[PDB]
Structure formats: structure tokens, C-alpha cells
């Protein structure tokens, strides 16, 4: 009988905290400064989601999680 | 309904077992009578334990 000896790797880890900005500069912008503004995201034509569902952007496969929709040309 | 179980709660001692028995007796009686007679003879303040299942078939 001995110990478990979970000691060789990772003696201490620091928590992963997201530097989420309180100001919507990276998230949304108007670039117009007017009452009527344009939106920098593609209109979703799917009717399995809501009418206010806006997707973000990555290098590909805009990862919504709920639907896993990826734009492909068939 | 035999059930054999080790006597010692731990695993120490001579291997000793309790042999428990549960003996269930069952009897059937056949007759010809309408339902009212059967349900009038059933409610006779039966002594405990004698479960009754009355069937029509």
C-alpha cells in the first residue's frame, strides 16, 4: 500500500478567466453614427431558430452550438 | 422460499449460514354460485394472513 501520488505533473494550476469586455466594441458596431444602421452579420434563413438569432464569426463553421450550421455549396 | 445468508456481518469466524424458510401454502376450491353469495360469504371477519383471490372463469 502506498499513496495515489498525483504529484509529478501540474503542481498548481490557475483558473481560466475570460477578459470579456463590458463595452461592445469587438462584438457589435455601427460604423455609421445614424439612426438607421447596418448589421455586420449574415441574415439567417433557417426557421428552426428565432427572429433575433444573430451568429458570430470564426475562421469557419460559425459555431452556434444549438444547430451546428455550416455554410456549404452542396 | 429458501434464503441462505452468512451469519457474520464481517468476514471473520467459521463459515456459518442462516437458512431462512418462508413456506407459502395455497388452496383452491371450486363451486357454482352467483356473485352475491360469494361476496356475502367472504365478509366473515377473516383471521389475518389468509389472502383470498376469488375468480370467475
Amino acid at each position: 500500500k502506498k499513496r495515489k501520488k498525483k504529484s509529478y505533473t501540474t503542481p498548481k494550476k490557475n483558473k481560466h478567466k475570460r477578459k470579456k469586455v463590458k463595452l461592445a466594441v469587438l462584438k457589435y458596431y455601427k460604423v455609421d453614427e445614424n439612426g438607421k444602421i447596418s448589421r455586420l452579420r449574415r441574415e439567417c434563413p433557417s426557421d428552426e431558430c428565432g427572429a433575433g438569432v444573430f451568429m458570430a464569426s470564426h475562421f469557419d463553421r460559425h459555431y452556434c452550438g444549438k444547430c451546428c450550421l455550416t455554410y456549404c455549396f452542396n | 422460499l429458501r434464503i441462505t445468508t452468512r451469519k457474520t456481518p464481517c468476514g471473520e469466524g467459521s463459515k456459518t449460514w442462516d437458512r431462512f424458510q418462508m413456506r407459502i401454502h395455497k388452496r383452491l376450491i371450486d363451486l357454482h354460485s352467483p356473485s352475491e353469495i360469494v361476496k356475502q360469504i367472504t365478509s366473515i371477519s377473516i383471521e389475518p394472513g389468509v389472502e383470498v383471490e376469488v375468480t370467475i372463469a
Binding site: - | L1, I24, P48, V50, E51
Partner: protein, 79 residues
């Protein structure tokens, strides 16, 4: 819906044993002695023996009503 007669009798014994233990840990201070169930057509009358009864009923049967409510909502009998 229907279970085998050996299982039925074992379950009835389990009913009796757990009811006895439950009202032993409930009202041992009431001088409880034993509990007996009575076979009745499509009903299960239960008669409980205690040295003192004025305490087990109490005032207007608060203890009795509490016990019947908990036993009903525990055992799954019809209302």
C-alpha cells in the same frame, strides 16, 4: 399490475417491517408496542398498539392525521 405470489408475500412482509420500524422511530416515547394490519375486502385497515393513547391521538388527532398523511404519501396506496 401483477407480481408473483412469492414476491407478493415478500413485499407484504417488507410493508409490515418498514411500517413497524417507521412508527417505532416515530412514537417510541408514546409507549408504542406493536402494529397489526387487518385483511379487509379491497382495503387495508391498520390497528396500532400503544400504552398511552391520549398522547398518540393528542388534541383532535394532529399526530394521527400527520401519521396517516405520511403513510399514504409514502406507501403509494390509493387516496
Amino acid at each position: 399490475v401483477q407480481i408473483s405470489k412469492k414476491r407478493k408475500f415478500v413485499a407484504d412482509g417488507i410493508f409490515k417491517a418498514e411500517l413497524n420500524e417507521f412508527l417505532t422511530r416515530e412514537l417510541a416515547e408514546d409507549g408504542y408496542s406493536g402494529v397489526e394490519v387487518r385483511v379487509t375486502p379491497t382495503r387495508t385497515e391498520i390497528i396500532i398498539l400503544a400504552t398511552r393513547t391520549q398522547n398518540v391521538l393528542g388534541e383532535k388527532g394532529r399526530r394521527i392525521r400527520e401519521l396517516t398523511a405520511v403513510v399514504q404519501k409514502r406507501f403509494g396506496f390509493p387516496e
